[PDB]
Short mmCIF file of C-alpha atoms in Angstrom, two decimals:
data_model
loop_
_atom_site.label_atom_id
_atom_site.label_comp_id
_atom_site.label_asym_id
_atom_site.label_seq_id
_atom_site.Cartn_x
_atom_site.Cartn_y
_atom_site.Cartn_z
CA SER A 1 197.70 119.86 15.80
CA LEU A 2 195.73 119.19 12.63
CA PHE A 3 193.25 117.28 14.47
CA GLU A 4 192.43 120.29 16.80
CA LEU A 5 192.72 122.51 13.73
CA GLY A 6 190.54 120.60 11.70
CA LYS A 7 188.13 120.59 14.22
CA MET A 8 188.20 124.21 14.92
CA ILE A 9 187.54 124.84 11.23
CA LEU A 10 184.85 122.45 11.38
CA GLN A 11 183.39 124.02 14.58
CA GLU A 12 183.65 127.64 13.12
CA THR A 13 182.70 127.26 9.49
CA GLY A 14 180.45 124.06 9.65
CA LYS A 15 182.84 123.03 6.90
CA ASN A 16 184.91 120.06 6.03
CA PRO A 17 188.24 121.42 6.61
CA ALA A 18 190.35 119.34 4.24
CA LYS A 19 187.52 119.63 1.53
CA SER A 20 186.84 123.54 1.85
CA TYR A 21 190.44 124.62 2.65
CA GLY A 22 192.84 121.61 2.09
CA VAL A 23 193.83 122.93 -1.17
CA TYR A 24 192.28 126.29 -1.50
CA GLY A 25 194.03 129.22 -2.88
CA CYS A 26 197.58 130.08 -2.29
CA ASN A 27 197.69 129.48 1.23
CA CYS A 28 195.14 127.14 2.39
CA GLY A 29 195.89 123.39 3.16
CA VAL A 30 199.26 122.07 2.76
CA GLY A 31 201.85 123.60 0.34
CA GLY A 32 203.22 126.81 1.85
CA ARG A 33 202.24 130.48 1.37
CA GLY A 34 201.41 132.26 -1.54
CA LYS A 35 199.84 135.36 -2.58
CA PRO A 36 196.15 135.35 -1.04
CA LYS A 37 193.72 135.04 -3.60
CA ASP A 38 191.17 136.02 -1.59
CA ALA A 39 190.37 136.86 2.50
CA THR A 40 189.69 133.11 2.93
CA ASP A 41 193.00 132.56 1.38
CA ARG A 42 194.74 135.25 3.45
CA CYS A 43 193.33 133.57 6.71
CA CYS A 44 195.46 130.62 5.70
CA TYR A 45 198.50 132.98 4.79
CA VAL A 46 198.38 134.56 8.48
CA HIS A 47 197.76 131.26 9.73
CA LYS A 48 200.65 130.06 8.11
CA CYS A 49 202.63 132.96 9.30
CA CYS A 50 201.48 132.31 12.74
CA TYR A 51 202.83 128.72 12.64
CA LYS A 52 206.14 129.83 10.77
CA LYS A 53 206.75 132.03 14.31
CA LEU A 54 206.22 129.12 16.64
CA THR A 55 209.29 127.51 18.28
CA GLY A 56 208.95 124.59 20.73
CA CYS A 57 206.40 122.68 19.24
CA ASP A 58 205.04 121.01 16.03
CA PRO A 59 202.06 122.88 14.54
CA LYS A 60 201.08 119.70 12.57
CA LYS A 61 201.18 117.24 15.06
CA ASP A 62 201.48 118.44 18.74
CA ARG A 63 198.23 117.99 20.50
CA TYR A 64 196.86 120.64 22.67
CA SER A 65 193.53 121.15 24.80
CA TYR A 66 190.83 123.52 23.35
CA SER A 67 187.32 123.59 24.17
CA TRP A 68 184.18 124.69 22.24
CA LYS A 69 182.50 126.94 24.95
CA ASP A 70 179.55 128.85 24.17
CA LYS A 71 180.44 128.39 20.55
CA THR A 72 183.63 129.90 20.98
CA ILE A 73 187.14 128.18 20.73
CA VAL A 74 188.70 128.68 23.81
CA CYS A 75 192.30 127.19 23.92
CA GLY A 76 193.44 125.65 27.03
CA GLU A 77 196.28 127.15 28.76
CA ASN A 78 198.02 124.62 27.32
CA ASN A 79 202.04 125.65 27.41
CA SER A 80 203.14 129.06 25.66
CA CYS A 81 203.98 127.23 22.46
CA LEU A 82 200.78 125.19 22.39
CA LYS A 83 198.67 127.92 23.30
CA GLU A 84 200.08 130.20 20.42
CA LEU A 85 199.46 127.15 18.47
CA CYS A 86 196.04 126.71 19.31
CA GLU A 87 195.36 130.71 18.90
CA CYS A 88 196.93 130.42 15.39
CA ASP A 89 194.27 127.58 14.68
CA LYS A 90 191.48 129.47 16.40
CA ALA A 91 192.53 132.65 14.45
CA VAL A 92 192.41 130.86 11.22
CA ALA A 93 189.35 128.79 12.17
CA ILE A 94 187.61 131.95 12.75
CA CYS A 95 188.75 133.85 10.04
CA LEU A 96 187.82 131.38 7.70
CA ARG A 97 184.34 131.47 8.77
CA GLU A 98 184.31 135.13 8.96
CA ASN A 99 185.18 135.16 5.09
CA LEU A 100 182.99 132.27 4.27
CA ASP A 101 180.97 135.11 2.55
CA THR A 102 183.67 135.66 -0.33
CA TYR A 103 184.58 131.74 0.08
CA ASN A 104 185.06 131.01 -3.59
CA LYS A 105 184.92 127.36 -4.80
CA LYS A 106 186.65 128.43 -7.84
CA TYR A 107 189.76 128.61 -5.53
CA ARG A 108 188.99 125.39 -3.50
CA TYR A 109 190.68 122.99 -5.55
CA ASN A 110 193.85 124.34 -6.37
CA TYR A 111 196.23 121.79 -7.84
CA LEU A 112 198.69 124.76 -8.71
CA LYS A 113 199.66 126.16 -5.48
CA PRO A 114 203.49 126.30 -6.60
CA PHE A 115 202.47 128.74 -9.29
CA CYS A 116 200.82 131.06 -6.80
CA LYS A 117 202.64 134.48 -6.73
CA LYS A 118 205.48 134.10 -4.23
CA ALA A 119 204.41 135.33 -0.67
CA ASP A 120 205.78 138.13 1.27
CA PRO A 121 207.92 137.23 3.96
CA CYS A 122 205.58 136.64 7.13
CA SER B 1 204.60 120.60 -13.78
CA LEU B 2 201.29 120.32 -11.99
CA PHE B 3 199.48 121.89 -15.14
CA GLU B 4 200.55 118.65 -17.17
CA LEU B 5 200.00 116.48 -13.78
CA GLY B 6 196.59 117.60 -13.23
CA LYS B 7 195.63 117.69 -16.87
CA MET B 8 196.89 113.93 -17.24
CA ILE B 9 195.13 112.88 -14.04
CA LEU B 10 192.11 114.69 -15.66
CA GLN B 11 192.47 113.04 -18.69
CA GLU B 12 193.02 109.55 -17.50
CA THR B 13 190.66 109.50 -14.32
CA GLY B 14 188.02 112.05 -15.57
CA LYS B 15 188.53 113.35 -12.04
CA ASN B 16 189.17 116.93 -11.08
CA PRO B 17 192.76 116.18 -9.86
CA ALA B 18 192.80 118.60 -6.96
CA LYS B 19 189.52 117.74 -5.84
CA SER B 20 190.08 113.90 -6.01
CA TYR B 21 193.90 113.77 -5.48
CA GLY B 22 194.92 116.95 -3.87
CA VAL B 23 194.49 115.95 -0.52
CA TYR B 24 193.75 112.26 -0.91
CA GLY B 25 195.16 109.52 1.52
CA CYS B 26 198.95 110.08 2.77
CA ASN B 27 200.70 110.52 -0.51
CA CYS B 28 198.25 112.29 -2.99
CA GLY B 29 198.56 116.12 -3.34
CA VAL B 30 201.11 118.14 -1.82
CA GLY B 31 202.69 116.94 1.36
CA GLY B 32 204.97 114.24 1.00
CA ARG B 33 204.50 110.35 1.46
CA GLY B 34 203.15 108.29 3.98
CA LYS B 35 201.91 104.43 4.39
CA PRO B 36 199.56 104.45 1.43
CA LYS B 37 195.85 104.08 2.55
CA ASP B 38 195.02 102.24 -0.68
CA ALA B 39 196.12 101.44 -4.15
CA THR B 40 195.18 105.00 -5.29
CA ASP B 41 197.20 106.55 -2.48
CA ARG B 42 200.10 104.03 -3.48
CA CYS B 43 199.86 105.65 -6.97
CA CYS B 44 200.85 109.10 -5.34
CA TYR B 45 203.39 107.24 -3.33
CA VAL B 46 205.14 105.86 -6.19
CA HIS B 47 204.79 108.87 -7.95
CA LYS B 48 206.31 111.08 -5.17
CA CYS B 49 209.24 108.60 -5.02
CA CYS B 50 209.40 108.63 -9.16
CA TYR B 51 209.81 112.52 -8.54
CA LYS B 52 212.46 112.03 -5.80
CA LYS B 53 214.66 110.42 -8.51
CA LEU B 54 214.39 113.39 -10.89
CA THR B 55 217.20 115.98 -10.84
CA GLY B 56 217.58 118.96 -12.98
CA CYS B 57 213.85 119.94 -13.14
CA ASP B 58 211.31 120.96 -10.76
CA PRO B 59 208.50 118.38 -10.77
CA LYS B 60 205.80 121.05 -9.36
CA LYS B 61 206.59 123.71 -11.70
CA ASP B 62 208.41 122.86 -14.91
CA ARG B 63 206.32 122.56 -17.70
CA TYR B 64 206.79 119.84 -20.40
CA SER B 65 204.99 118.82 -23.59
CA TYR B 66 203.03 115.62 -23.77
CA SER B 67 200.24 114.72 -25.88
CA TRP B 68 196.78 112.92 -25.44
CA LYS B 69 197.19 110.60 -28.34
CA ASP B 70 194.52 107.74 -28.93
CA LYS B 71 193.54 108.25 -25.34
CA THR B 72 196.89 107.67 -24.17
CA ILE B 73 199.38 110.11 -22.38
CA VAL B 74 202.57 110.52 -24.71
CA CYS B 75 205.21 112.23 -23.41
CA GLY B 76 206.95 114.72 -25.40
CA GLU B 77 210.77 114.39 -25.66
CA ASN B 78 211.47 117.73 -23.82
CA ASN B 79 214.80 117.11 -22.14
CA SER B 80 215.70 114.10 -19.93
CA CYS B 81 214.42 115.50 -16.59
CA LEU B 82 211.16 116.34 -18.07
CA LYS B 83 210.69 113.41 -20.04
CA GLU B 84 211.32 111.24 -16.84
CA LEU B 85 209.12 113.94 -14.94
CA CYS B 86 206.18 113.48 -17.76
CA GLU B 87 206.64 109.67 -17.39
CA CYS B 88 206.19 110.20 -13.68
CA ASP B 89 203.33 112.07 -14.22
CA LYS B 90 201.91 109.78 -16.73
CA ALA B 91 202.47 106.72 -14.62
CA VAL B 92 200.45 108.15 -11.69
CA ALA B 93 197.80 109.40 -13.88
CA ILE B 94 197.38 105.86 -15.57
CA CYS B 95 197.75 104.50 -11.97
CA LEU B 96 195.03 106.58 -10.38
CA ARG B 97 192.73 105.77 -13.11
CA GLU B 98 193.75 102.15 -12.76
CA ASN B 99 192.69 102.32 -9.31
CA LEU B 100 189.55 104.32 -9.56
CA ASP B 101 187.61 101.28 -8.66
CA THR B 102 188.93 101.26 -4.93
CA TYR B 103 189.10 105.01 -4.90
CA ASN B 104 187.83 105.55 -1.52
CA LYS B 105 186.21 109.17 -0.72
CA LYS B 106 186.92 108.71 2.57
CA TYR B 107 190.55 109.25 1.90
CA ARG B 108 189.83 111.89 -0.32
CA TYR B 109 189.99 114.70 2.17
CA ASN B 110 192.71 113.90 4.54
CA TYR B 111 193.47 116.84 6.74
CA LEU B 112 195.87 114.80 8.46
CA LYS B 113 198.49 113.63 6.19
CA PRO B 114 201.16 114.47 8.84
CA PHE B 115 199.72 111.39 10.87
CA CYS B 116 200.20 109.28 8.20
CA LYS B 117 202.66 106.21 9.15
CA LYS B 118 205.87 107.11 7.87
CA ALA B 119 206.72 106.38 4.28
CA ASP B 120 209.07 103.69 3.44
CA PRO B 121 212.23 104.94 1.66
CA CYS B 122 211.70 105.33 -2.09
#
């Protein structure tokens, strides 16, 4: 769920998930996908695409087990869907962190997501 | 559109709309409605309901004219839906502004809007 996702992003990036990625670019946070504005945004793009593919569980609300072991998100062996969900979340948290170097505050508070160029299909 | 809306919110509240109301509470910013966390959130609640009554225009993207006259949002005539849209946006900007005094930064960055109690029907 967003609980785990939020925590992962926090654990990885060291950033407040909602603050730094709640309305970032065309893909981070709620809204759907749009043309990624940068690497950070594409993390979220990929992440949402990851969600799209998920069947059998709710990415937003379904809880799952993961742990923070040796500063690594380790998804619990939940079930197939929740594991994928966890891995989606882990991936984006890692991705967001990996792309903190190009994280652009200019993209941080995007009130204009619907005006993002349409996203390619996932 | 979110251009006018954001601008209205800015003009009324002085606040960066996406920062302060992009992810605030259960109702502000993208996402839908939820039980308002407070008066600010309830503005957005009312706003989103206001949107629900619109037909013939896209509240997110359809631009419309309004002027900032005597520190008042004055909706241009536009057309019926855009006028009504503008009035929705005006109302929430005003409401957001009116409720700055209880604007709670602890609701500002809600990564968990899906976990908000379900909104009442509009």
